[PDB]
Structure 1
Amino acid sequence: QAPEERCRLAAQACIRACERYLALCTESSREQRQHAGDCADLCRLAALLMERRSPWAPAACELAARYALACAERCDGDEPLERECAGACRRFVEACRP
């Protein structure tokens, strides 16, 4: 699996984690939900660009990673949905550096 393929997969696993946290988490704050959504949206963009081999892929990838960690810093807690959302955000960023 090429680093771009694992980064794409990590990004998709991220939006799934974020959209899940958004609709399932019963203790989320308006701000926290907003952070999850920003990461989910940006990750959809970076993902679509990675698939279409766009020269903007890397650019969008970093913008997504920025909010990906900002989302973890704000939405990580103790419940599974919370650790999962923050985890997936981490896993995504970890696949951006390479």
Structure 2
Amino acid sequence: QAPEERCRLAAQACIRACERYLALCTESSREQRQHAGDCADLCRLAALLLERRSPWAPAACELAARYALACAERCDGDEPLERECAGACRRFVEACRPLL
């Protein structure tokens, strides 16, 4: 229930949706796959520092949130694999607010 945990949980969700997206979406472009792929790895970093309750986690969360919304913008779509990703990214960005 703690803000770090809620943010870590959201990061995990962003990771799944992102990896599923670039793995399953057959209509994605290079640009979109680069956005979803980098967003997955960035959220990985954030979740890892959130878990260890690192004093540097917020700095990593800021960067991840910055590109997570950029991914939500480029990957959003009406298709399930597209909205799940974009949504998870939005939710993660939202969870970072209290930690900044």
Structure 1 counterpart SS, 2:12: helix
Between the aligned partners of 2:66 and 2:38, the Cα distance in structure 1 is 10
Between the aligned partners of 2:28 and 2:50, the Cα distance in structure 1 is 30
Between the aligned partners of 1:39 and 1:84, the Cα distance in structure 2 is 14
Please report the RMSD computed on the Cα atoms of aligned residues, expressed in angstroms.
Answer: 0.5
- 1:2 corresponding residue in structure 2: 2
Answer whether contact 2:14 2:89 (CA < 8 A) is retained: yes
- 2:41 corresponding residue in structure 1: 41
The offset of 1:76, in angstroms, is 0.5
The offset of 1:52, in angstroms, is 1.1
Answer whether contact 2:72 2:90 (CA < 8 A) is retained: yes
Which digits, 9 at most, give the CA deviation of each residue in 1:35-56, with x for residues without a partner? 0011101100010001111111
Answer whether contact 2:4 2:53 (CA < 8 A) is retained: no
Structure 1 residue 72 and structure 2 residue 72: aligned? yes
How many residue pairs get matched?
98
Between the aligned partners of 1:5 and 1:14, the Cα distance in structure 2 is 14
Answer whether contact 2:69 2:90 (CA < 8 A) is retained: yes
- 2:26 corresponding residue in structure 1: 26
Between the aligned partners of 1:97 and 1:11, the Cα distance in structure 2 is 13
Identical counterparts, % of pairs: 99
Answer whether contact 2:4 2:51 (CA < 8 A) is retained: no
Between the aligned partners of 1:24 and 1:58, the Cα distance in structure 2 is 31
- TM-score when normalising by structure 2: 0.96
- TM-score when normalising by structure 1: 0.98
